Amino acid sequence: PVLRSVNSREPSQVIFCNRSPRVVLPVWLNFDGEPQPYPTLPPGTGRRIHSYRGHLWLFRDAGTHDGLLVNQTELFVPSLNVDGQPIFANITLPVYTLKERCLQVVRSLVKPENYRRLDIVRSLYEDLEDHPNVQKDLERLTQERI
Amino acid sequence: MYVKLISSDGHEFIVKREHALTSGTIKAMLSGNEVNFREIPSHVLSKVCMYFTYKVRYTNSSTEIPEFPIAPEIALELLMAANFLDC
Amino acid sequence: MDVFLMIRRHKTTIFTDAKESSTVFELKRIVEGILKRPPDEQRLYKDDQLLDDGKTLGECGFTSQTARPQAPATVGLAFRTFEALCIEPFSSPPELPDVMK
Ligand SMILES: CC(=O)N[C@H](C(=O)N1C[C@H](O)C[C@H]1C(=O)NCc1ccc(-c2scnc2C)cc1)C(C)(C)C
Ligand SMILES: *CCC(=O)Nc1cc(OCc2cnn(C)c2)ccc1S(=O)(=O)N(C)C
């Protein structure tokens, strides 16, 4: 795959800093591009972690899989540490569209089997059902890269 | 310039024109000073206006982005309004 | 630093921002430009407290922390004998749907 960690074996220490109000799930893309879940970060916390140069990470809301930003972009790639300094991965909320924010709230209150009972047009039912997904995002980022 | 957005229950919301242009629908209506939303009530339209303020303030900003709050009781109607307004 | 407001009278609500160091009188000049009523024909309030022309918005309680873009603070407005301050509430949301409980 285009999006995958490189097996560099070159250590890089990183500080994951959750500057969001969400519980953050760090996601590591393995050497075949398959995403792997790592321990979650509570809001406003920082974790010093051992990663490697050329590895790829993305960050989501742990409970809903909403996309989050890391250093203002989608993907985080550690580089070599300079003078023993760790690399910062500042995780933040994007400015979601109002429509996406509303879909997040409604999904959080209604079981998918009960989306059918909501008095909304069919297109909004389709929008609710189209949950955020790491596989879908990796496909999109793959096209954006090419 | 300011523009007036009127709710179904007659509240008039006066907002900066550039902020109302956050909505693609409102932008098109103003292309192409007052718009009447016959199906959007004031408990929803007031929240839409807060969203415009939030979007303009925080888009391409470096300062920490806070959550945009939505009470469960308004979420369904606010979703319908956001879908119509394209914002 | 900016402060984010809703200036409200009857069923009119103006969304605007102002510097925390700007004054009550300068906010009446903003209202004038929008609603075409001069400052002497306006009374501005924070809750039922009448605000003094010479105080800054910060000195009245409107600060960056408490008057946020996504949760603006309300400034009440009454026009001129002055009418009583009267802000109509926004509509009541319907009962929460069964599938959201
Ligand atoms: C040489 C190499 O590439 N090793 C990999 C490796 O060690 N990795 C891959 C990523 O770069 C992350 C790194 C790793 O597993 N480090 C240990 C680790 C443990 C906990 C955490 C986290 S994330 C949030 N909280 C914690 C405690 C982060 C990293 C594995 C063993 C998975 C093949
Ligand atoms: C969440 C943990 C963390 O990293 N906090 C933090 C980082 C910080 O980094 C500034 C910086 C300088 N050079 N780079 C590349 C980054 C400054 C402060 C803090 S904090 O005070 O813990 N925080 C709560 C803002």
Interface check for A110 against chain B (CB to CB < 8 A): the answer is no
Residue A8 C-alpha, separation from nearest chain B C-alpha, in angstroms: 32
C98 contacts in chain A (CB < 8 Å): 117
Helix axes A98-109, B72-85, angle to 10 degrees: 140
**Closest Cα partner for B76 from A115, A93, C71, A130?**
A115
Categorise residue B15: left if φ over 0, alpha if ψ from -120 to 50, beta otherwise.
beta
Q: What H or E segment, with its residue span, contains residue A38?
A: none
Whether A42 and A53 map to the same domain: the answer is: yes
Q: Which of A71, A92, A113 is the C-terminal boundary of a domain?
A: A92
Angle formed at CA A63 by CA B87 and CA A116, multiple of 5 degrees: 60
* Cβ A65 vs Cβ A39: under 8 Å: no
Whether A75 and A101 map to the same domain: the answer is: no
Tell me the C-alpha distance between C15 and B40, whole Å.
Answer: 18
CATH number at A83 reads 2.60.40.780
Whether A88 and A105 map to the same domain: the answer is: no
* Cβ A104 vs Cβ A60: under 8 Å: no
User: Within 13 Å of residue A78, how many CA atoms lie on the same side as its CB?
Assistant: 29
Tell me the C-alpha distance between A100 and A3, whole Å.
Answer: 26
Whether A43 and A12 map to the same domain: the answer is: yes
- Resolution in units of Å: 1.5
Domain of A101 in residue numbering reads as 93-144
User: Within 13 Å of residue B68, how many CA atoms lie on the same side as its CB?
Assistant: 29
Q: Which CATH number fits domain B17-84: 3.30.530.20, 3.40.50.150, 3.30.710.10, 2.40.30.10?
A: 3.30.710.10
Q: Of A82, A88, A91, which is best to mutate to test ligand 2, by the most ligand atoms within 8 angstroms of its C-beta?
A: A88
**Closest Cα partner for A64 from A104, A119, A117, A15?**
A104
Query: In degrees rounded to 5, what are phi and psi of residue C19?
Result: -70, 145
Question: From the list B14, B42, B68, which residue is nearest C14 (CB)?
Answer: B14
**Closest Cα partner for A71 from A93, A89, A50?**
A89
Which residue is associated with the tokens 């926004």? C90
Residue A38 CB less than 6 A away from ligand 1: yes
In chain C, domain spans: 2-81
Q: What is the topology classification, in CATH, of domain C2-81?
A: Ubiquitin-like (UB roll) (3.10.20)
Tell me the C-alpha distance between B24 and C91, whole Å.
Answer: 25
The 3-state DSSP class for residue C11 equals coil
